[PDB]
Amino acid sequence: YFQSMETNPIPVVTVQTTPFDDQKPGTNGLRKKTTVFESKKNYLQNYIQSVLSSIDLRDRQGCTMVVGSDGRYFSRTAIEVIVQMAAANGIGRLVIGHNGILSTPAVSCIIRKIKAIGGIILTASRNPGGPNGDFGIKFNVANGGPAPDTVIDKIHQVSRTLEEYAICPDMRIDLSRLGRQDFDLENKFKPFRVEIVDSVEVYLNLLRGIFDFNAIKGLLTGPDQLKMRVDAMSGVMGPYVRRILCDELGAPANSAVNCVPLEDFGGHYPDPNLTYATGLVDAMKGGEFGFGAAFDADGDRCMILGQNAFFVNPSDSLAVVAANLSCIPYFRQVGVRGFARSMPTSTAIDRVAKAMKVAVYETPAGWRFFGNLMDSGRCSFCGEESFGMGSDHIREKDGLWTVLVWLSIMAARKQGVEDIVRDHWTKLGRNYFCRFDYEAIDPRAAFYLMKDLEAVISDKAFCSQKFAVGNSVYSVEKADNFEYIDPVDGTVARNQGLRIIFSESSRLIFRLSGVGATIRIYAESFERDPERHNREPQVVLGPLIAIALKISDIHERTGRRGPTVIT
Ligand SMILES: [Ca+2]
Ligand code: NA
Ligand code: NA
Ligand code: NA
Ligand code: NA
Ligand code: NI
């Protein structure tokens, strides 16, 4: 028994609604066109309710949730609705970033730091922002990582059947002022608490214990200072770059580019790659900078560029960092438990894992599966070919972490980006790698393309086949439709990519990702000869690409005669 006082209690409102059929989140949350969440009636409310209902009402009552966004248009409105419906659903406290700004890694860090039950991240990553752009809602769980396939099924089940939802429509929240905002609610004893927190502080504190900030600051300052351009692409990472790389680590202000978060990302796709980070590439090509980097909208993906815009392939970045973790105080003290990569990612890191005698895991695309490997201590470091890298310091990929680990390696090795990569190739060989994206193709054609290709590579005699393109020859070693049985919780992921492994240390992978679908073709060829480590990837891999387009017959089936994007 307890007694207390209230003043002007905010009422709770129940609303009759109708379920939607498509409110199941994908691998990176539920993404729709912004107008769907903004104007389709009760669409936003239905999904927030379903997300909150996926938490046991006894664990839910009096719990804490973290909320953050990448800053895109509509984020503030979604946050307000989220606050009004968390209050109405018995949530004890919300920790929200200043101005609604929290990077995906920061959310993951804060969830774990304060032992929250989970968090909602409002981001559509690389996809454009604005009224006619895209909007997404990610849900992370208590370990700070993406929701497992089991919680997704729960969220879906509730969304299909949701008949009502609860909300406090009269509640208003000010995201601009740091500090606590308590609310007396009808039928709630304890006041409902909203903490507006600095977007960067707690996340920065985590990094300060991981890295040697003195070594990094020495690299960025002094007469022999690294000249550097870091482009947050007008997304969430702006304040993180300024507060951490400039203020704390001493980088000059002109190193921070597009570091004002914008609701439309400045009218550009917040996608860190050679195709869309054209401003960074043009600056790096001038030859004036020894290090470049771009982040995506929510700050978990990162492109690394060397002097003269030397492109560090994400699969090479993974292997290079894995081979130099000893340069980092964190890993010197806690050790390296194991590595993990998504199956489409190049096998470069596998060669590092072999030399170091550490386990390497091969997972489906998506960070969901790295989390169990980290939670169980099987893995300490992992990454994906899609510009993603991370460690067990959180349960999300981390772009700024990727920059700091690279700077730490450069400072400790007294070398630039290109020399580190080329030395790495000399030591272990080079895994030539590229990815073709065929975007927004007829999902009907995509279906039959994969169905037919799966039948081809599954034929009994396919392992006895060999292919010739010009003077090059490739002999099928094994081929399958990739499957992953989670070694921790037993989750089974089927149809995770068609894979052809050739005898001549080469691979082809086919993955099927609005209405349209995306087919991704990955090609990999290993080169041991150190004198053949400066060929153009499209030349080395041309033959394998030709095989891919032929056996898949993608150009005919889709009417395209070329990929949309090449990485
Ligand atoms: Ca064979
Ligand atoms: Na994300
Ligand atoms: Na994305
Ligand atoms: Na508090
Ligand atoms: Na991919
Ligand atoms: Ni992202």
Residue numbers in the entry: -4 to -1, 1 to 509, 514 to 567
Tell me, in the authors' exact words, what the paper reports.
We here present crystal structures of herring PGM5, the first structures of this protein from any species. As expected, all four domains contribute to the active site with one loop per domain; loop 1 (residues 119–126), loop 2 (residues 292–297), loop 3 (residues 379–384), and loop 4 (residues 507–520).
The bPGM5 structure consists of residues 1–567, except for residues 510–513, as well as four ordered residues from the His6-tag. In bPGM5 that was crystallized in the presence of 120 mM calcium acetate, the metal in the active site has 2.0–2.8 Å coordination distances and shows too strong electron density for both magnesium and calcium.
